[PDB]
A paper describes a structure:
Aldose reductases (EC 1.1.1.21) are ubiquitous NADPH-dependent oxidoreductases that catalyze the reduction of aldehydes to alcohols. Instead, it is believed that ethanol is produced by the reduction of acetaldehyde by aldose reductase in an NADPH-dependent reaction. G. lamblia is the etiological agent of giardiasis, a common cause of diarrheal disease in the developing world. Typical aldose reductases exhibit the TIM-barrel fold with eight α-helices on the exterior and an eight-stranded β-barrel in the interior.
Residue numbers in the entry:
A (entry chain A), B (entry chain B): 0 to 211, 219 to 313
The structure:
């Protein structure tokens, strides 16, 4: 019954196990119906406890089929024989029998070493990569849909030419591309390319995220704070409202994260904010003065995927 | 090699998976040889990546047999048949073939429901308990020693009468009792009872912990502050030095936790701190003016275990 992820979703990166169960419970009870997960976030079992508690309880008013659940194939599981195994492990942890969506997390194949390092690195701090064609990984992802383990598959951090090439050999097309989009990195050409080619888009770090002590770039933005103040809301909600007005299609969704119940609830009201054309112009100007790609493997893995 | 846990250990409660690997690696490389873990800390797999890496090759300089590794049976696994199952799971996560010590985490048997809630509570917010005699659980713990899965077994949060009764039914004696001990909760009568009966003692929250937002009571103490200042050290090293001078026996250990590399290294120098007899009297008087048991299930589970 859902064709694409619900427009307003909920992220789980960096939420420790001890916070994320309460966070997901709060999101679900607040009304979010799209939860973004990943194996590499090291918290799927805690999330699964939230799903089990809510979906098994006929009193919560929320059933499994009301919720879109996404997870992601980690970089060290790109060898085809590892794809189904991780899918099943992720589902077991999440206490689900199927995923709505399973993504290739990055177009980077990491070695899977004998201690199971999530981020294997050589002495220079560069990620240790494995020889796995992206098409081999994709074919393995397709088999998950054929078996019925997952309803849809997609990609994340794929660039235009990777998407173009995928479209030329995919038997099952990627449902979406999940990529970094926010007022400091609007990513317009790539979004348009996806949507023009019938691929949905999911905006990660939609409020600018928590990145290098980690900082929240949104807290320094005078433009977002001025619009928020004048409208009796938060800069967070103004950012989220900007996404959904800018790209007014059910094929585009946002996945804001908080592990703080008050913020989870407050962010859910972003759909009530009405931005003017002047508001949209002002926000669209932010990246002309400050443009930043935060989630850049050139930085943390010494692999310049986006160059 | 080790009859009792090394005196200076390292705790891992509340360390998220994303921080705890680095934390454990920092501790081991600094010189700690006692790592305190638990299933319920939701981070054993991350800790395992540290152990797996370090113990794989002699080139690290630290062999498995150089390190004392403790874990703990969670409250929902008191049913005898669940004890070995959890022991094996814990060990798989930690990437070890044996534990030096496996503890009964609490003398509370929680129900293990169909969604695996770690903290099952009723409508009134009270923990939901299961009918499992403590002696039944203990017999199942003894089997782990007979099989060779663990070298030693022990208890945590056991009171004097529970310990007396255990000594009377045990075929394998508990090696230690792990309990809350710090300047605000010196726990003298219980410590003395254990040691007098040939049961070791491991001091958890040795610096007063991070507890109800969460606060560190040690940073408001003018007594530890004045002594730390006088001796050119931290209140943290003074509190740790107090423990090891007060109870000067190989049977008594402390497990200070930090997920912060600089603090992990700094705490390890507590052994160089030379406290005087008047320093000891000053620290010993703190609980007369401020006595607090932080880790009290009367608060968070509505079960008054310590009353
Ligand atoms: N490669 C990938 O596919 C990829 C990469 C990045 C992210 N993602 C996904 O996208 C999700 C969202 O991105 P993100 O987590 O990077 O960043 P984000 O959602 O843009 O921002 C998260 C940060 O904002 C804070 N925050 C949220 N609401 C707030 C409010 N109302 N007031 C004040 N602070 C607020 C959070 O703090 P608290 O939590 O402390 O409240 C956290 O520090 C992730 O969780 C993950 O699911 C995917
Ligand atoms: N029921 C049980 O058997 C039980 C119960 C509680 C604890 N435990 C065990 O006992 C261990 C120790 O107890 P604990 O973790 O409750 O409390 P603790 O070790 O007394 O104190 C931990 C707190 O002190 C901070 N800290 C440590 N060293 C510091 C320094 N040098 N400077 C500034 N801050 C410092 C830590 O912050 P950062 O980490 O942010 O640096 C953390 O907030 C636990 O981790 C666990 O393994 C067992």
């Amino acid at each position: 019954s859902m064709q694409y992820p619900p427009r307003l979703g909920f992220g789980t990166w960096q939420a420790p196990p001890e916070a994320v169960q309460t966070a997901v419970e709060t999101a679900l009870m607040t009304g979010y119906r799209h939860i973004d997960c990943a194996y590499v976030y090291q918290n799927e079992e805690a999330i699964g406890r939230a799903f089990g508690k809510i979906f098994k309880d006929a009193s919560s008013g929320i059933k499994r089929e009301d919720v879109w659940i996404t997870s992601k194939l980690w970089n060290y599981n790109h060898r085809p024989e590892l794809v189904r195994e991780q899918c099943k492990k992720t589902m077991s942890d999440l206490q689900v029998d199927y995923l709505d969506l399973f993504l290739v997390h990055w177009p980077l194949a990491f070695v899977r070493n004998d201690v199971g390092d999530l981020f294997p690195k050589d002495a220079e701090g560069r990620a240790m990569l494995e020889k796995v064609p992206l098409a081999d990984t994709w074919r393995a992802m397709e088999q998950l849909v054929e078996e019925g383990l997952v309803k849809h598959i997609g990609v994340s951090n794929y660039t235009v030419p990777l998407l173009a090439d995928l479209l030329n050999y995919a038997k099952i097309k990627p449902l979406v591309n999940q990529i970094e989009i926010h007022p400091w990195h609007p990513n317009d050409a790539t979004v348009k390319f996806c949507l023009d080619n019938g691929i949905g888009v999911t905006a990660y770090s939609p409020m600018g995220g928590s990145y290098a002590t980690q900082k929240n770039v949104i807290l320094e933005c005078k433009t977002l704070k001025a619009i928020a103040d004048a409208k009796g809301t938060s800069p967070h909600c103004v950012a989220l409202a900007w996404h959904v007005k800018k790209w007014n299609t059910s094929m585009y969704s946002v996945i804001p994260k908080s592990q703080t119940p008050a913020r989870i609830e407050a962010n859910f009201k972003c759909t009530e904010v009405q931005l003017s054309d002047d508001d949209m112009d002002a926000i669209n100007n932010i990246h002309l003065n400050k443009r930043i790609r935060f989630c850049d493997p050139a930085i943390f893995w010494k692999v310049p995927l986006f160059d």
